[PDB]
Amino acid sequence: QIGLAQTQ
């Protein structure tokens, strides 16, 4: 289980 969230 991997959750990866990115914002710029």
Residues 1 and 6: their CA atoms lie apart, in Å, by 17
> How many angstroms separate the CA atoms of 8 and 6, rounded?
7
| Dist CA 3 CA 1 (whole Å) | 7
Q: Which method was used? A: electron diffraction
- For 2, the token pair is 């991997």
In degrees rounded to 5, what are phi and psi of residue 4? -135, 115
Q: How many angstroms separate the CA atoms of 7 and 1, rounded?
A: 20
Q: Could you give the maximum distance between any two Cα atoms of the chain, in Å?
A: 24
Please write down the HEC assignment for all residues of the chain. CCCCCCCC
Instruction: Please tell me the distance from the alpha carbon of residue 5 to that of residue 8, in angstroms, as a whole number.
Output: 11
Locate 1 and state its tokens. Answer: 């289980």
CA 8 – CA 2 distance, rounded (Å): 20
